[PDB]
Write a protein that binds this ligand. Structure first.
Ligand SMILES: O=c1ccn([C@@H]2O[C@H](COP(=O)(O)OP(=O)(O)O)[C@@H](O)[C@H]2O)c(=O)[nH]1
Ligand SMILES: [Cl-]
Length: 401
């Protein structure tokens, strides 16, 4: 048994990094290790309450509580850094973060996980290079991602000066963001009779690669005309969101305090929720006929990692509807074959044949027995692919190598 310190130096954002950090903590504790979850409070975020953590998470102001921060990070055997300060923090924040890295006990094994994809996101970081150089173990979502192919080669140039050193780049291991899929099912799974087959619920946030435009399109072309309802949760307001109205796309927007105002009846525009509490969404999703996760990252960013919203759909008992090309570009953890090559119960949304996609949805909607068989397959498939029991063990073995 060891002491683990999970550190989110960017702060607790409430999305995938936070989710990963919490699932990571759960796995370590479940496996007999001691864990402290620490996050920089210097920068605040909108979804800090999306996940349950307040009863154990340890906030620290890097710019003003360096001593506190240092004592925390040096009180472990393994330090896991899941995020670094954002480009908008004050000098004291980033300066003290860099000082932390330099003063971490040399004997402590520092593990760095790069949870983001595009360079756009990656460059919005401060001190990532210094973090990578101190790391004893580095993880990324793809061998061909921007982190591996752009930043790493930039920090470790394949062409040195003259009086410097060649310094080979450190090894970067692939990883999948795990979730205790069994735990979610044991808490939210509903009997098929409790599910409203006419509800189509998309979950994510306002970033175009999450595929929200495709959901609006699918609602307009097939779901709305068929008398079905569409709900989209997690779309925060921002310049990207403003583009929706500018394009003339109809929708009704709500906050949690007005969720009871959502019109879930036929012939309505997409109903949008600005932000969601994870547990509340899982409850709503478990009673929804079909869940949608239409992320469409470029192939370079895809290896084996599905996202948490992908896993949540299968885990809570709805029928998962995923972006076809993503399934084609991802490989099954078990045998390394495309996710689409399996009879998984997952409906692979095809933008080039949405008619076929909706036909399958109507088929499952009309036969509760079939519906049940299909989601049991999806649950098992996703469990085999990315449950914490498998993935965190794989990562633990790599970390302790
Ligand atoms: O308003 C929101 C938006 C997202 N999430 C959760 O935050 C995580 C997001 O991780 P994912 O890997 O799906 O994508 P990311 O946000 O990290 O790119 C998932 O557990 C979502 O259910 C949430 O609880 N509330
Ligand atoms: Cl996050």
């Amino acid at each position: 048994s060891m002491r683990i310190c999970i550190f989110m130096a960017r702060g607790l954002e409430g999305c995938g990094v936070t989710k990963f950090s919490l699932e990571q903590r759960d796995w370590f504790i479940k496996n007999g290790h001691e864990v402290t979850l620490v996050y920089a409070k210097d920068k605040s975020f909108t979804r800090t309450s999306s996940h349950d953590h307040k009863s154990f998470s340890i906030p620290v102001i890097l710019a003003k509580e360096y001593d506190k921060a240092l004592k925390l990070v040096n009180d472990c055997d393994i330090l896991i850094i899941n995020s670094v300060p954002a480009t908008s923090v004050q000098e004291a924040t980033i300066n003290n973060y860099k000082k932390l890295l330099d003063n971490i006990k040399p004997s402590i094994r520092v593990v760095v996980y790069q949870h983001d994809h595009s360079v756009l996101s990656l460059r919005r970081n401060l001190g990532l290079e210094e973090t990578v150089r101190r790391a004893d173990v580095i993880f990324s979502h793809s061998d061909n991602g921007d982190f591996n192919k752009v930043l790493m080669k930039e920090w470790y140039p394949e062409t040195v000066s003259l009086f410097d050193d060649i310094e080979e780049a450190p090894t970067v291991y692939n990883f999948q963001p795990p979730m205790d899929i069994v735990k979610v099912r044991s808490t939210y799974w509903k009997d098929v009779s409790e599910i409203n087959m006419n509800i189509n619920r998309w979950i994510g946030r306002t970033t175009t690669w999450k595929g929200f435009y495709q959901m609006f399109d699918f609602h307009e072309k097939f779901l709305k005309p068929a008398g079905k309802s569409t709900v989209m949760e997690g779309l925060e307001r921002s310049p990207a969101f403003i583009a929706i109205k500018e394009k003339g796309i109809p929708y009704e927007y709500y906050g949690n305090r007005e969720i009871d105002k959502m019109n879930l009846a036929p012939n309505q525009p997409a109903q949008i929720l600005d932000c969601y509490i994870n547990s509340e969404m899982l409850e709503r999703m478990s009673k929804s006929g079909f869940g949608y996760q239409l992320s469409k990252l470029n192939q370079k960013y895809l290896q084996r990692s599905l996202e948490y919203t992908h896993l949540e759909l299968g885990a809570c008992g709805t029928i998962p509807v995923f972006w076809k090309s993503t399934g084609e570009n991802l490989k099954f953890r078990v045998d390394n074959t495309p996710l689409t090559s399996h009879d998984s119960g997952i409906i692979w949304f095809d933008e080039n044949d949405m008619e076929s996609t909706f036909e399958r949805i109507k088929e499952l909607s009309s036969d509760r027995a079939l519906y049940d068989r299909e989601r049991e397959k999806a649950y098992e498939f996703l469990y085999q692919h990315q449950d914490s029991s498998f993935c965190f063990k794989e990562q633990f073995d790599i970390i302790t190598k």
